[PDB]
Design a protein around this ligand. Structure first.
Ligand SMILES: *[C@@H]1O[C@H](CO)[C@@H](O[C@@H]2O[C@H](CO)[C@@H](O[C@@H]3O[C@H](CO)[C@@H](O)[C@H](O)[C@@H]3O)[C@H](O)[C@H]2NC(C)=O)[C@H](O)[C@H]1NC(C)=O
Ligand SMILES: *[C@@H]1O[C@H](CO)[C@@H](O[C@@H]2O[C@H](CO)[C@@H](O)[C@H](O)[C@H]2NC(C)=O)[C@H](O)[C@H]1NC(C)=O
Ligand SMILES: *[C@@H]1O[C@H](CO)[C@@H](O[C@@H]2O[C@H](CO)[C@@H](O)[C@H](O)[C@H]2NC(C)=O)[C@H](O)[C@H]1NC(C)=O
Ligand code: NAG
Ligand code: CA
Ligand code: CA
Ligand code: CA
Ligand code: CA
Ligand code: CA
Ligand code: CA
Ligand code: CA
Ligand code: CA
Lengths: 94, 737
């Protein structure tokens, strides 16, 4: 149960990765909006979200994709609390 | 004798009494007959008898028996052969047990997968959960497991994880199963409980009816709307969820050959019922749809106006009708909606081989001639197959009906073949056809070429005579059709022209050569065919006068009774579009080439004009009004938009409509699209399928139009024919009306 940002030049920016099922994985950019980024920033203590980026802006990841179709309302405390298709249910590419 | 620590009074650890005290029994040598006699002795049902102690604990005290052998006849256990009492070395982790049941209370399921017939093998014996051990688990046992559940043959020892599965403690250990019994319970010596599955995994299985495909609604054997069964229930498929690789796998499973086209909309009629939400991700090489990965979607599906259909190669409907036995008689086939007998004139034994290999009975013995097996019911079909004898279906053979000569009165084809199903050369390459190209000969288990020294029309006549291609028009050398690889078999060919096979020539002998691969020989025969649309701007344009190449000369095709399907075949063969329109003759400039053929009628199956029946070849001089002029529809269209020329971009290629991925879609490409359609300057280039998801394969990706190209194929594109994209990212454009 860990969340991390990689390749962003700092701890409060970059590609989002979630540790689950014993490995790090990514989140698809489908429906990725400012509210989900707000949830990520709140979880990491980085404040309020300013950009939500997709299309591998910070570089293509490696490993499995864990969550697609994130529909956070913006007030959740942890990212996994949001509604989604479930762990491993994805139709995306890196 | 007693059973203790078990689910019921009929299952548990087995105990025996001696001298006044109870004790356990060692499982070694304890087989199904021992459990049978143990069940029989006690007042318990004996229909099914199994080994093992169910959820019972370890033993206590002394072990009072070991390695018994009852053979099933002795009424009681102690009447069997047994070893010294108390004097054995088994530890308390090896205690025996028995499980007796009526047989109506045993049930096994598959859980964790996508249907009834894919998952981990869960077992229910007397209301106790369990699992089957990987140790000894193979497709031969999985076959009986999926035969009992009502599904097809097992295909894989894995599955897709649709749902999680709860943990369980007991285990079921299975011995070798013969592979033909109709239930896992009938396998010999299967143990329930006891031993632990340490260093082993759970039994997994996937079988045929997981994603079983089907085609319905078509008017020809191998085309129709696609439907799939998820174990028990049928459902259609969205055209946005089916790919070219998935189509190939589908038509491989159904024995329909290679895929000819994917058709969107509701080409074969709207269906009724469920529409699945699974996106296939086949790599192309699978054998069953069940083995492909899939991505489900919890959200909604398309409308029924988007059911996918498929057309595949094996469209020939051929049968034997009249005869003493169902594997001998007259040969008939249906085309243009009518049945008819074939023509014997160019029908040989190698064709009969594939005729009765298609019907799965033996090989051909002879080809009776005349009315020996019945006369035709009416009109005779003039199709001429050129089977090489190694293919399992007639639809895999080359076929030709265009311009075939009319048959005599009563020359009808017939075939006789044996019943034993167990019963089981020159080639022209790189010529753009079957009757033209580099000549390769198969002698010593390998293909080799022929030198061009002393190579003239006299030998090309023999080559074009043995293969079934008429006469020779060109005898080319100097590796005209590309360099070959392999042996150089022949040199100094001195055929006289009347020989029937190539090796009957006074060559220098096999391997006697002084040539290199830059001297490989080739031929162009009279039956070579090519199609062309001619215009002043270009000789290979997509709109102009239609011409056919035959007997070494170009000619024209008459417009008499030219149907929509025929123009569609012409446009598809030339690679222009799916359909086209006939025009009155232009006035720019008309060369005086003759006319070759007329009255061309194409059925709905073939994708080349060579397979359409027509009147025989006849060179005549006819007026320019009798010429055939065709304009093929645009190769690019915009669909689902609010106006004529705004919406999602679709492109025709490889026999199918498809879409353009939006990885590098921009306004410079929208300019090209709008200009090509003949519409005003582009305004917006969209992304992520604004106007809905597309149909068919993704033909294009990362297009790099500079903004002034005349067509999308003039633009560069690092991808063409293959894309790492999904239908959720189709490109669209909005242009000025
Ligand atoms: C292995 O499996 C068997 C089969 O379940 C176990 O036997 C069952 O053990 C449970 C205790 O977990 C018994 O439950 C008790 O039943 C009585 C009924 O009057 C009730 O008074 C208690 O409150 C409790 O529910 C159960 O009767 C017993 N038998 C059956 C048929 O369920 C067994 O204990 C397991 N272990 C071994 C070492 O065999
Ligand atoms: C993060 O979002 C901001 C907007 O809040 C983006 O900044 C704008 O970028 C566009 C495009 O280059 C410029 O035309 C605007 O002038 C910028 N500022 C504003 C206030 O709109 C920024 O580019 C985004 N960054 C990333 C990496 O996506
Ligand atoms: C096949 O042979 C024909 C002649 O039978 C060749 O046609 C001639 O081609 C030359 C060019 O090499 C032209 O100058 C002539 O006008 C053509 N016609 C005639 C009647 O000579 C044809 O080129 C040959 N094709 C190949 C591939 O070798
Ligand atoms: C296309 O662009 C025109 C001009 O901006 C606009 O009026 C029209 O609504 C646009 N169409 C779509 C489908 O967005
Ligand atoms: Ca996306
Ligand atoms: Ca969202
Ligand atoms: Ca998605
Ligand atoms: Ca030479
Ligand atoms: Ca010669
Ligand atoms: Ca020589
Ligand atoms: Ca994209
Ligand atoms: Ca571009």
């Amino acid at each position: 149960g860990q969340l991390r940002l990689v390749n962003g030049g700092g701890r409060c920016a970059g590609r989002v990765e979630i540790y689950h099922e014993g490995s790090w994985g990514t989140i698809c950019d489908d429906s990725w909006d400012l509210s989900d980024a707000h949830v990520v920033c709140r979880q990491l203590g980085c404040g309020e979200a300013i950009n939500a980026t997709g299309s591998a802006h910070f570089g293509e990841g490696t490993g499995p994709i864990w969550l697609d179709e994130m529909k956070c309302n913006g007030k959740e405390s942890r990212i996994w609390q949001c509604h989604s298709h479930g762990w491993g249910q994805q139709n995306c590419r890196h | 004798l007693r059973l203790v620590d078990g689910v019921t009074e009929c299952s548990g650890r087995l105990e025996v009494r001696f001298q006044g005290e109870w004790g356990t029994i060692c499982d070694d040598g304890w087989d199904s007959y021992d459990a049978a006699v143990a069940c029989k002795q006690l007042g318990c049902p004996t229909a099914v008898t199994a080994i093992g102690r169910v959820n019972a604990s370890k033993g206590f005290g002394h072990i009072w028996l070991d390695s018994v052998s009852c053979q099933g006849h002795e009424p009681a256990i102690w009447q069997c052969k047994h070893h010294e009492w108390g004097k054995h070395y088994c530890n308390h982790n090896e205690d025996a047990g028995v499980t007796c049941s009526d047989g109506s209370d045993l049930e096994l399921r598959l859980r964790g997968g996508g249907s009834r017939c894919a998952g981990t093998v869960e077992v229910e014996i007397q209301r106790l959960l369990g699992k089957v051990c990987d140790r000894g688990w193979g497709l031969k046992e999985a076959d009986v497991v999926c035969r009992q559940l009502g599904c097809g043959s097992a295909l894989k020892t894995s599955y897709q994880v649709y749902s999680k599965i709860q943990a369980t403690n007991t285990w079921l250990f299975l011995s070798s199963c013969n592979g033909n019994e109709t239930s896992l319970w009938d396998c010999k010596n299967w143990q329930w409980g006891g031993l632990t599955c340490d260093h082993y995994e759970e039994a997994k299985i996937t079988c045929s009816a997981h994603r079983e495909p089907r085609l319905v609604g078509g008017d020809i054997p191998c085309s129709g709307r696609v439907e799939v069964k998820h174990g028990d229930t049928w459902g259609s498929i969205c055209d946005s969820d089916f790919s070219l690789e998935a189509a190939s796998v589908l038509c491989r499973e159904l024995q329909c050959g290679t895929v000819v086209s994917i058709l969107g909309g509701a080409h074969f009629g709207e269906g009724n019922g469920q529409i699945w939400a699974e996106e296939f991700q086949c790599e192309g090489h699978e054998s069953h749809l069940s083995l492909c990965p899939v991505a489900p979607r919890p959200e909604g599906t398309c409308s029924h106006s988007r059911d996918v259909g498929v057309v595949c190669s094996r469209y020939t409907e051929i049968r034997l009708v009249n005869g003493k036995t169902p594997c001998e008689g007259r040969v008939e086939l249906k085309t243009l909606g009518a049945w008819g007998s074939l023509c014997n004139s160019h029908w040989d034994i190698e064709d009969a081989h594939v005729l009765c290999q298609q019907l799965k009975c033996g090989v051909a013995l002879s080809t009776p001639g005349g009315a020996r097996f019945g006369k035709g019911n009416g009109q005779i079909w003039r199709h001429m197959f050129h089977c090489t004898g190694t293919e399992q279906h007639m639809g895999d053979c080359p076929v030709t009906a265009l311009g075939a000569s009319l048959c005599p009165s009563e020359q009808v084809a017939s075939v006789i073949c044996s019943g034993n199903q167990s019963q089981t050369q020159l080639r022209l390459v790189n010529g753009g056809g079957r009757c033209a190209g580099r000549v390769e000969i198969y002698h010593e288990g390998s293909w080799g070429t022929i030198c061009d020294d002393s190579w003239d029309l006299s030998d090309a006549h023999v080559v074009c005579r043995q293969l079934g291609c008429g006469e020779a028009i060109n005898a080319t050398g100097s590796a005209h059709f590309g360099e070959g690889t392999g042996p150089i078999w022949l040199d100094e060919m001195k055929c006289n022209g009347k020989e029937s096979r190539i090796w009957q020539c006074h060559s220098h002998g096999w391997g006697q050569q002084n040539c290199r691969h830059k001297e490989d020989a080739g031929v162009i025969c009279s039956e070579f065919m090519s199609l062309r649309l001619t215009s002043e701007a270009s000789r290979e344009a997509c709109a102009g006068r239609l011409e056919v190449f035959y007997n070494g000369a170009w000619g024209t095709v008459g417009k008499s009774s030219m149907s929509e399907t025929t123009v569609g075949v012409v446009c598809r063969q030339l690679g222009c579009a799916d359909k086209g329109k006939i025009n009155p003759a232009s006035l720019d400039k008309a060369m005086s080439i003759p006319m070759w053929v007329d009255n061309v009628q194409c059925p709905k199956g073939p994708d080349t004009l060579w397979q359409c029946p027509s009147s025989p070849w006849e060179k005549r001089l006819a007026s320019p009004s009798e010429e055939t002029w065709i304009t093929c529809d645009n190769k690019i269209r915009l669909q689902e938009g609010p106006t004529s020329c705004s919406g999602r971009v679709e492109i025709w290629h490889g026999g199918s409509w498809g879409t353009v991925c939006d990885d590098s879609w921009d306004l410079d490409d929208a300019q090209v699209v709008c200009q090509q359609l003949g519409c005003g300057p582009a305004l917006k280039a969209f992304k992520e399928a604004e106007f809905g998801q597309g149909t068919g394969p993704i033909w294009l990706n990362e297009v790099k139009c500079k903004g002034n190209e005349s067509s999308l194929w003039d633009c560069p594109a690092r991808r063409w024919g293959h894309s790492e994209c999904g239908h959720k990212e189709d490109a669209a454009v909005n242009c000025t009306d």
